[PDB]
Ligand binder design. Structure first.
Ligand SMILES: Cc1ccc(C(=O)c2cc(O)c(O)c([N+](=O)[O-])c2)cc1
Ligand SMILES: Cc1ccc(C(=O)c2cc(O)c(O)c([N+](=O)[O-])c2)cc1
Lengths: 112, 116, 116, 112
Protein backbone atom coordinates (compact mmCIF):
# COMPACT_ATOMS: atom_id res chain seq x y z
CA UNK A 1 0.00 0.00 0.00
CA UNK A 2 1.47 3.33 -1.12
CA UNK A 3 -1.25 5.38 0.64
CA UNK A 4 -2.61 4.89 4.15
CA UNK A 5 -4.81 6.99 6.43
CA UNK A 6 -4.68 6.91 10.23
CA UNK A 7 -7.19 8.74 12.43
CA UNK A 8 -6.89 9.29 16.20
CA UNK A 9 -9.41 10.56 18.79
CA UNK A 10 -7.97 13.21 21.14
CA UNK A 11 -10.97 13.12 23.51
CA UNK A 12 -10.98 9.38 24.12
CA UNK A 13 -7.22 8.91 23.64
CA UNK A 14 -7.73 6.03 21.22
CA UNK A 15 -7.93 5.20 17.54
CA UNK A 16 -10.91 6.78 15.80
CA UNK A 17 -12.82 3.71 14.61
CA UNK A 18 -15.25 3.44 11.69
CA UNK A 19 -14.50 6.89 10.34
CA UNK A 20 -15.46 7.20 6.67
CA UNK A 21 -12.64 8.42 4.38
CA UNK A 22 -12.94 9.37 0.70
CA UNK A 23 -9.96 10.02 -1.57
CA UNK A 24 -10.18 12.00 -4.83
CA UNK A 25 -7.72 12.82 -7.61
CA UNK A 26 -7.72 16.13 -9.45
CA UNK A 27 -8.78 15.60 -13.07
CA UNK A 28 -7.60 17.68 -16.04
CA UNK A 29 -10.88 19.61 -15.74
CA UNK A 30 -9.69 20.50 -12.23
CA UNK A 31 -12.67 18.47 -11.08
CA UNK A 32 -12.29 16.15 -8.09
CA UNK A 33 -12.66 12.57 -9.39
CA UNK A 34 -13.41 9.76 -6.90
CA UNK A 35 -10.37 7.53 -6.36
CA UNK A 36 -10.76 5.33 -3.23
CA UNK A 37 -12.67 5.15 0.06
CA UNK A 38 -13.13 3.10 3.20
CA UNK A 39 -13.68 3.12 6.95
CA UNK A 40 -10.89 3.12 9.52
CA UNK A 41 -10.30 -0.16 11.38
CA UNK A 42 -10.18 -0.81 15.14
CA UNK A 43 -6.61 0.52 15.04
CA UNK A 44 -7.82 3.69 13.35
CA UNK A 45 -6.01 2.69 10.15
CA UNK A 46 -7.33 2.46 6.60
CA UNK A 47 -5.07 0.36 4.35
CA UNK A 48 -5.34 -0.96 0.83
CA UNK A 49 -6.87 2.18 -0.63
CA UNK A 50 -4.83 1.91 -3.83
CA UNK A 51 -2.01 0.10 -5.64
CA UNK A 52 1.42 1.30 -6.73
CA UNK A 53 0.46 1.19 -10.41
CA UNK A 54 -2.74 3.21 -9.84
CA UNK A 55 -1.17 5.81 -7.47
CA UNK A 56 0.43 8.11 -10.02
CA UNK A 57 1.80 11.59 -9.46
CA UNK A 58 -0.92 14.18 -9.09
CA UNK A 59 -2.94 16.20 -6.63
CA UNK A 60 -5.04 14.19 -4.20
CA UNK A 61 -7.78 15.14 -1.76
CA UNK A 62 -8.53 13.09 1.39
CA UNK A 63 -11.91 13.89 2.96
CA UNK A 64 -12.40 12.59 6.52
CA UNK A 65 -16.03 12.49 7.75
CA UNK A 66 -15.34 13.91 11.17
CA UNK A 67 -18.89 15.18 11.68
CA UNK A 68 -20.46 11.71 11.51
CA UNK A 69 -17.80 10.34 13.86
CA UNK A 70 -18.57 12.88 16.58
CA UNK A 71 -22.31 12.57 15.93
CA UNK A 72 -22.11 8.81 16.51
CA UNK A 73 -20.44 9.56 19.87
CA UNK A 74 -23.05 12.14 20.90
CA UNK A 75 -20.54 15.02 20.80
CA UNK A 76 -21.18 18.32 19.06
CA UNK A 77 -18.60 18.97 16.33
CA UNK A 78 -17.50 22.25 14.78
CA UNK A 79 -16.27 21.15 11.32
CA UNK A 80 -18.26 19.67 8.45
CA UNK A 81 -15.30 17.36 7.65
CA UNK A 82 -11.53 17.48 7.46
CA UNK A 83 -9.92 17.77 4.04
CA UNK A 84 -6.26 17.11 3.25
CA UNK A 85 -5.01 18.15 -0.19
CA UNK A 86 -1.47 17.33 -1.32
CA UNK A 87 0.73 16.54 -4.30
CA UNK A 88 2.09 12.99 -4.60
CA UNK A 89 5.76 12.85 -5.70
CA UNK A 90 7.35 6.47 -1.71
CA UNK A 91 4.81 5.36 0.91
CA UNK A 92 2.41 8.00 2.28
CA UNK A 93 0.58 7.98 5.59
CA UNK A 94 -1.87 10.83 6.12
CA UNK A 95 -2.55 11.00 9.86
CA UNK A 96 -5.26 13.08 11.54
CA UNK A 97 -5.76 13.80 15.22
CA UNK A 98 -9.38 14.77 15.92
CA UNK A 99 -11.06 16.91 18.57
CA UNK A 100 -14.66 18.18 18.37
CA UNK A 101 -13.53 21.75 17.55
CA UNK A 102 -10.00 21.16 16.29
CA UNK A 103 -7.93 18.79 14.20
CA UNK A 104 -4.36 18.41 13.06
CA UNK A 105 -2.94 16.43 10.20
CA UNK A 106 0.55 15.45 9.17
CA UNK A 107 2.29 13.50 6.42
CA UNK A 108 4.57 10.60 7.27
CA UNK A 109 6.43 9.72 4.08
CA UNK A 110 8.87 6.82 4.23
CA UNK A 111 11.00 4.91 1.73
CA UNK A 112 11.06 1.04 1.73
CA UNK B 1 -15.90 41.72 13.43
CA UNK B 2 -17.61 38.30 13.55
CA UNK B 3 -15.05 36.25 11.58
CA UNK B 4 -11.29 36.49 12.24
CA UNK B 5 -8.51 34.24 10.97
CA UNK B 6 -5.18 33.87 12.75
CA UNK B 7 -2.18 31.98 11.31
CA UNK B 8 1.01 31.00 13.17
CA UNK B 9 4.32 29.55 11.89
CA UNK B 10 5.52 26.56 13.99
CA UNK B 11 9.01 26.58 12.40
CA UNK B 12 9.97 30.18 13.12
CA UNK B 13 7.78 30.51 16.21
CA UNK B 14 6.08 33.63 14.94
CA UNK B 15 2.92 34.92 13.26
CA UNK B 16 2.53 33.74 9.68
CA UNK B 17 2.61 37.09 7.84
CA UNK B 18 1.00 37.92 4.47
CA UNK B 19 -0.86 34.60 4.14
CA UNK B 20 -3.67 34.78 1.63
CA UNK B 21 -7.06 33.63 2.92
CA UNK B 22 -10.17 33.12 0.74
CA UNK B 23 -13.65 32.60 2.25
CA UNK B 24 -16.60 30.98 0.44
CA UNK B 25 -20.23 30.37 1.35
CA UNK B 26 -22.26 27.43 0.13
CA UNK B 27 -25.05 28.68 -2.16
CA UNK B 28 -28.58 27.38 -2.67
CA UNK B 29 -27.41 25.42 -5.73
CA UNK B 30 -24.69 23.69 -3.62
CA UNK B 31 -21.86 25.56 -5.35
CA UNK B 32 -19.21 27.55 -3.46
CA UNK B 33 -19.65 31.26 -3.86
CA UNK B 34 -16.87 33.78 -3.07
CA UNK B 35 -17.61 35.53 0.24
CA UNK B 36 -14.53 37.50 1.34
CA UNK B 37 -10.75 37.39 1.16
CA UNK B 38 -7.65 39.01 2.60
CA UNK B 39 -4.05 38.64 3.83
CA UNK B 40 -2.82 38.14 7.35
CA UNK B 41 -1.12 41.17 8.96
CA UNK B 42 2.20 41.48 10.81
CA UNK B 43 0.51 39.89 13.82
CA UNK B 44 -0.70 36.88 11.78
CA UNK B 45 -4.29 38.13 12.08
CA UNK B 46 -6.88 38.86 9.40
CA UNK B 47 -9.69 41.18 10.52
CA UNK B 48 -12.46 42.88 8.61
CA UNK B 49 -13.42 39.98 6.37
CA UNK B 50 -17.14 40.52 6.94
CA UNK B 51 -19.88 42.23 8.99
CA UNK B 52 -22.68 41.16 11.31
CA UNK B 53 -25.26 41.84 8.57
CA UNK B 54 -23.37 40.02 5.81
CA UNK B 55 -22.36 36.96 7.90
CA UNK B 56 -25.68 35.11 7.86
CA UNK B 57 -26.35 31.46 8.66
CA UNK B 58 -24.64 29.15 6.22
CA UNK B 59 -21.86 26.70 5.52
CA UNK B 60 -18.55 28.49 5.08
CA UNK B 61 -15.18 27.43 3.70
CA UNK B 62 -11.94 29.17 4.75
CA UNK B 63 -9.09 28.27 2.36
CA UNK B 64 -5.67 29.25 3.71
CA UNK B 65 -2.96 29.52 1.02
CA UNK B 66 -0.26 27.70 2.96
CA UNK B 67 1.61 26.59 -0.18
CA UNK B 68 2.42 30.14 -1.34
CA UNK B 69 3.45 31.03 2.22
CA UNK B 70 6.06 28.27 2.42
CA UNK B 71 7.21 28.61 -1.19
CA UNK B 72 7.97 32.32 -0.64
CA UNK B 73 10.25 31.14 2.22
CA UNK B 74 12.06 28.61 -0.03
CA UNK B 75 10.25 25.58 1.38
CA UNK B 76 8.35 23.03 -0.68
CA UNK B 77 5.46 22.05 1.62
CA UNK B 78 3.30 18.94 1.61
CA UNK B 79 -0.18 20.47 1.43
CA UNK B 80 -1.73 22.48 -1.37
CA UNK B 81 -3.62 24.59 1.18
CA UNK B 82 -5.51 24.20 4.43
CA UNK B 83 -9.31 24.25 4.15
CA UNK B 84 -11.64 24.73 7.13
CA UNK B 85 -15.38 24.10 6.51
CA UNK B 86 -18.05 24.75 9.11
CA UNK B 87 -21.66 25.73 9.74
CA UNK B 88 -21.93 29.21 11.19
CA UNK B 89 -24.69 30.95 13.18
CA UNK B 90 -27.10 27.97 13.31
CA UNK B 91 -28.18 28.92 16.86
CA UNK B 92 -27.86 32.68 16.38
CA UNK B 93 -24.95 35.00 15.61
CA UNK B 94 -21.58 34.05 17.05
CA UNK B 95 -18.06 35.43 16.78
CA UNK B 96 -15.60 32.99 15.22
CA UNK B 97 -11.82 32.91 15.28
CA UNK B 98 -10.36 30.31 12.92
CA UNK B 99 -6.73 29.70 13.90
CA UNK B 100 -4.17 27.59 12.08
CA UNK B 101 -0.66 26.58 13.13
CA UNK B 102 1.57 25.79 10.15
CA UNK B 103 4.51 23.45 9.56
CA UNK B 104 5.86 22.43 6.16
CA UNK B 105 4.26 18.92 6.30
CA UNK B 106 1.60 19.43 8.94
CA UNK B 107 -0.98 21.89 10.21
CA UNK B 108 -3.55 22.07 12.94
CA UNK B 109 -6.62 24.22 13.11
CA UNK B 110 -9.00 25.21 15.86
CA UNK B 111 -12.06 27.35 16.37
CA UNK B 112 -12.78 29.85 19.14
CA UNK B 113 -16.53 30.59 19.16
CA UNK B 114 -17.81 33.25 21.54
CA UNK B 115 -21.22 34.85 22.10
CA UNK B 116 -20.86 38.68 21.72
CA UNK C 1 4.34 42.42 29.18
CA UNK C 2 7.13 40.11 27.93
CA UNK C 3 5.57 36.73 28.84
CA UNK C 4 1.94 35.86 28.06
CA UNK C 5 0.21 32.49 28.22
CA UNK C 6 -2.89 31.66 26.20
CA UNK C 7 -4.94 28.46 26.65
CA UNK C 8 -7.71 27.18 24.34
CA UNK C 9 -10.21 24.31 24.78
CA UNK C 10 -10.43 22.07 21.65
CA UNK C 11 -13.60 20.29 22.90
CA UNK C 12 -15.79 23.33 23.48
CA UNK C 13 -14.07 25.51 20.88
CA UNK C 14 -13.48 28.32 23.32
CA UNK C 15 -10.87 29.93 25.56
CA UNK C 16 -9.85 27.73 28.48
CA UNK C 17 -10.96 29.92 31.41
CA UNK C 18 -9.52 29.98 34.95
CA UNK C 19 -6.60 27.64 34.17
CA UNK C 20 -3.87 27.85 36.76
CA UNK C 21 -0.38 28.52 35.38
CA UNK C 22 2.86 28.36 37.43
CA UNK C 23 6.18 29.68 36.07
CA UNK C 24 9.63 28.65 37.36
CA UNK C 25 13.17 29.72 36.55
CA UNK C 26 16.18 27.44 36.74
CA UNK C 27 18.51 28.66 39.51
CA UNK C 28 22.29 28.59 39.75
CA UNK C 29 22.10 25.37 41.80
CA UNK C 30 20.01 23.70 39.02
CA UNK C 31 16.83 23.69 41.11
CA UNK C 32 13.53 25.17 39.91
CA UNK C 33 12.67 28.39 41.67
CA UNK C 34 9.14 29.88 41.66
CA UNK C 35 9.00 32.85 39.28
CA UNK C 36 5.36 33.88 38.76
CA UNK C 37 1.87 32.40 38.63
CA UNK C 38 -1.69 33.25 37.68
CA UNK C 39 -5.01 32.12 36.16
CA UNK C 40 -6.23 32.55 32.62
CA UNK C 41 -8.97 35.16 32.11
CA UNK C 42 -12.32 34.95 30.28
CA UNK C 43 -10.39 35.26 27.02
CA UNK C 44 -8.07 32.34 27.90
CA UNK C 45 -5.17 34.78 28.33
CA UNK C 46 -2.82 35.33 31.26
CA UNK C 47 -1.08 38.72 31.26
CA UNK C 48 1.05 40.47 33.84
CA UNK C 49 3.11 37.48 34.92
CA UNK C 50 6.37 39.44 34.85
CA UNK C 51 8.19 42.62 33.76
CA UNK C 52 11.02 43.52 31.41
CA UNK C 53 13.38 44.02 34.37
CA UNK C 54 12.43 40.77 36.14
CA UNK C 55 12.41 38.54 33.02
CA UNK C 56 16.17 38.09 32.60
CA UNK C 57 18.02 35.46 30.57
CA UNK C 58 17.39 31.99 31.88
CA UNK C 59 15.69 28.65 31.44
CA UNK C 60 12.00 28.88 32.28
CA UNK C 61 9.32 26.28 32.94
CA UNK C 62 5.61 27.03 32.38
CA UNK C 63 3.43 24.39 34.07
CA UNK C 64 -0.21 24.54 32.95
CA UNK C 65 -2.65 22.84 35.36
CA UNK C 66 -4.67 21.04 32.70
CA UNK C 67 -5.82 18.29 35.09
CA UNK C 68 -7.74 20.65 37.41
CA UNK C 69 -9.25 22.35 34.36
CA UNK C 70 -10.74 19.13 32.98
CA UNK C 71 -11.69 17.70 36.38
CA UNK C 72 -13.73 20.84 37.17
CA UNK C 73 -15.64 20.08 33.93
CA UNK C 74 -16.30 16.44 34.97
CA UNK C 75 -13.65 14.97 32.68
CA UNK C 76 -10.84 12.68 33.79
CA UNK C 77 -7.96 13.68 31.49
CA UNK C 78 -4.86 11.75 30.52
CA UNK C 79 -2.12 14.21 31.48
CA UNK C 80 -1.18 15.47 34.93
CA UNK C 81 -0.33 18.88 33.45
CA UNK C 82 1.36 20.39 30.43
CA UNK C 83 4.91 21.66 30.96
CA UNK C 84 6.72 23.97 28.53
CA UNK C 85 10.47 24.50 29.13
CA UNK C 86 12.56 26.95 27.13
CA UNK C 87 15.55 29.28 27.16
CA UNK C 88 14.50 32.91 27.10
CA UNK C 89 16.33 36.10 26.08
CA UNK C 90 19.61 34.42 25.03
CA UNK C 91 20.05 36.91 22.15
CA UNK C 92 18.47 39.87 23.95
CA UNK C 93 15.00 40.58 25.32
CA UNK C 94 12.07 39.10 23.40
CA UNK C 95 8.32 38.97 23.92
CA UNK C 96 6.98 35.43 24.31
CA UNK C 97 3.47 34.07 23.96
CA UNK C 98 3.18 30.45 25.10
CA UNK C 99 -0.07 29.02 23.72
CA UNK C 100 -1.60 25.64 24.47
CA UNK C 101 -4.60 23.93 22.89
CA UNK C 102 -6.21 21.38 25.21
CA UNK C 103 -8.10 18.12 24.70
CA UNK C 104 -8.78 15.52 27.40
CA UNK C 105 -6.06 13.11 26.09
CA UNK C 106 -3.93 15.44 24.01
CA UNK C 107 -2.47 18.92 23.90
CA UNK C 108 -0.32 20.98 21.61
CA UNK C 109 1.79 23.97 22.45
CA UNK C 110 3.48 26.65 20.42
CA UNK C 111 5.56 29.75 20.93
CA UNK C 112 5.17 33.17 19.33
CA UNK C 113 8.42 35.13 19.83
CA UNK C 114 8.53 38.74 18.69
CA UNK C 115 11.11 41.51 18.98
CA UNK C 116 9.47 44.56 20.72
CA UNK D 1 4.95 -4.04 25.32
CA UNK D 2 2.49 -2.09 27.47
CA UNK D 3 4.19 1.27 26.77
CA UNK D 4 5.39 2.61 23.43
CA UNK D 5 6.56 6.02 22.23
CA UNK D 6 6.21 7.29 18.66
CA UNK D 7 7.77 10.55 17.46
CA UNK D 8 7.04 12.30 14.14
CA UNK D 9 8.77 15.22 12.37
CA UNK D 10 6.34 17.87 11.07
CA UNK D 11 9.01 19.70 9.04
CA UNK D 12 10.29 16.70 7.10
CA UNK D 13 6.97 14.80 7.12
CA UNK D 14 8.62 11.61 8.34
CA UNK D 15 9.35 9.62 11.48
CA UNK D 16 11.70 11.39 13.88
CA UNK D 17 14.63 8.97 13.98
CA UNK D 18 17.20 8.52 16.76
CA UNK D 19 15.39 10.74 19.23
CA UNK D 20 16.43 10.00 22.81
CA UNK D 21 13.52 9.23 25.19
CA UNK D 22 13.73 8.82 28.98
CA UNK D 23 10.86 7.51 31.12
CA UNK D 24 10.61 8.11 34.88
CA UNK D 25 8.22 6.94 37.59
CA UNK D 26 7.18 9.12 40.52
CA UNK D 27 8.61 7.71 43.76
CA UNK D 28 6.98 8.01 47.19
CA UNK D 29 9.35 10.93 47.84
CA UNK D 30 7.69 12.56 44.83
CA UNK D 31 11.11 12.27 43.22
CA UNK D 32 11.35 11.23 39.57
CA UNK D 33 13.03 7.80 39.49
CA UNK D 34 14.55 6.54 36.21
CA UNK D 35 12.45 3.75 34.68
CA UNK D 36 13.36 3.14 31.00
CA UNK D 37 14.99 4.85 28.01
CA UNK D 38 15.92 4.38 24.38
CA UNK D 39 16.17 5.97 20.94
CA UNK D 40 13.39 5.93 18.36
CA UNK D 41 13.85 3.58 15.40
CA UNK D 42 13.71 4.34 11.66
CA UNK D 43 9.92 4.21 11.99
CA UNK D 44 10.06 6.75 14.81
CA UNK D 45 8.93 4.08 17.29
CA UNK D 46 10.49 3.05 20.59
CA UNK D 47 9.26 -0.37 21.75
CA UNK D 48 10.21 -2.70 24.56
CA UNK D 49 10.65 0.00 27.17
CA UNK D 50 9.05 -2.11 29.90
CA UNK D 51 7.17 -5.32 30.72
CA UNK D 52 3.62 -5.87 31.94
CA UNK D 53 4.82 -6.98 35.39
CA UNK D 54 7.06 -3.90 35.81
CA UNK D 55 4.53 -1.34 34.46
CA UNK D 56 2.40 -0.85 37.55
CA UNK D 57 -0.13 1.88 38.21
CA UNK D 58 1.48 5.20 39.00
CA UNK D 59 2.50 8.55 37.59
CA UNK D 60 4.99 8.43 34.75
CA UNK D 61 7.06 11.10 33.01
CA UNK D 62 8.26 10.74 29.39
CA UNK D 63 11.03 13.19 28.45
CA UNK D 64 11.70 13.53 24.71
CA UNK D 65 15.04 15.16 23.79
CA UNK D 66 13.67 17.39 21.08
CA UNK D 67 16.51 19.92 21.31
CA UNK D 68 19.20 17.41 20.31
CA UNK D 69 17.03 16.15 17.44
CA UNK D 70 16.68 19.61 15.90
CA UNK D 71 20.32 20.41 16.64
CA UNK D 72 21.41 17.31 14.72
CA UNK D 73 19.36 18.60 11.77
CA UNK D 74 20.83 22.11 11.92
CA UNK D 75 17.49 23.69 12.90
CA UNK D 76 17.05 26.13 15.76
CA UNK D 77 14.60 24.78 18.36
CA UNK D 78 12.53 26.66 20.92
CA UNK D 79 12.00 24.03 23.65
CA UNK D 80 14.58 22.39 25.91
CA UNK D 81 12.67 19.08 25.61
CA UNK D 82 9.11 17.79 25.56
CA UNK D 83 7.74 16.23 28.74
CA UNK D 84 4.61 14.10 28.98
CA UNK D 85 3.31 13.30 32.47
CA UNK D 86 0.37 10.95 32.98
CA UNK D 87 -1.21 8.41 35.30
CA UNK D 88 -1.23 4.77 34.19
CA UNK D 89 -4.53 2.96 34.91
CA UNK D 90 -4.07 -1.65 28.77
CA UNK D 91 -1.48 -0.76 26.10
CA UNK D 92 -0.25 2.86 25.96
CA UNK D 93 1.23 4.69 23.00
CA UNK D 94 2.49 8.20 23.72
CA UNK D 95 2.82 9.95 20.35
CA UNK D 96 4.51 13.30 19.75
CA UNK D 97 4.48 15.44 16.63
CA UNK D 98 7.47 17.80 16.57
CA UNK D 99 8.11 21.20 15.01
CA UNK D 100 11.05 23.48 15.91
CA UNK D 101 8.81 25.86 17.90
CA UNK D 102 5.79 23.66 18.61
CA UNK D 103 4.84 20.13 19.54
CA UNK D 104 1.70 18.14 20.21
CA UNK D 105 1.26 14.90 22.05
CA UNK D 106 -1.58 12.46 22.41
CA UNK D 107 -2.34 9.17 24.13
CA UNK D 108 -3.52 6.17 22.13
CA UNK D 109 -4.74 3.60 24.64
CA UNK D 110 -6.01 0.30 23.27
CA UNK D 111 -7.16 -3.01 24.75
CA UNK D 112 -5.87 -6.37 23.34
C1 LIG E 1 -0.73 24.83 19.87
C2 LIG E 1 -1.71 25.87 19.40
C3 LIG E 1 -2.40 25.71 18.22
C4 LIG E 1 -3.26 26.68 17.82
C5 LIG E 1 -3.41 27.80 18.62
C6 LIG E 1 -4.38 28.85 18.21
O1 LIG E 1 -5.25 28.55 17.50
C7 LIG E 1 -4.29 30.28 18.69
C8 LIG E 1 -5.46 30.99 18.72
C9 LIG E 1 -5.44 32.29 19.12
O2 LIG E 1 -6.65 32.97 19.13
C10 LIG E 1 -4.26 32.89 19.50
O3 LIG E 1 -4.25 34.20 19.91
C11 LIG E 1 -3.10 32.15 19.46
N1 LIG E 1 -1.85 32.72 19.85
O4 LIG E 1 -1.78 33.85 20.11
O5 LIG E 1 -0.92 32.04 19.90
C12 LIG E 1 -3.11 30.85 19.06
C13 LIG E 1 -2.73 27.96 19.80
C14 LIG E 1 -1.87 26.97 20.19
C1 LIG F 1 0.17 14.62 18.65
C2 LIG F 1 0.27 13.74 17.41
C3 LIG F 1 -0.55 13.99 16.33
C4 LIG F 1 -0.47 13.18 15.22
C5 LIG F 1 0.43 12.13 15.19
C6 LIG F 1 0.50 11.26 13.94
O1 LIG F 1 0.47 11.76 12.87
C7 LIG F 1 0.60 9.74 14.04
C8 LIG F 1 1.08 9.05 12.95
C9 LIG F 1 1.21 7.68 12.97
O2 LIG F 1 1.70 7.02 11.83
C10 LIG F 1 0.84 6.97 14.11
O3 LIG F 1 0.96 5.57 14.14
C11 LIG F 1 0.35 7.66 15.21
N1 LIG F 1 -0.02 6.91 16.41
O4 LIG F 1 -0.10 5.73 16.37
O5 LIG F 1 -0.23 7.47 17.43
C12 LIG F 1 0.23 9.04 15.18
C13 LIG F 1 1.27 11.88 16.27
C14 LIG F 1 1.18 12.69 17.39
Amino acid sequence: CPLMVKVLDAVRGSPAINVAVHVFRKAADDTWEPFASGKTSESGELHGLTTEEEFVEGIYKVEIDTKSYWKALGISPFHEHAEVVFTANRRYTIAALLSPCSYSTTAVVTNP
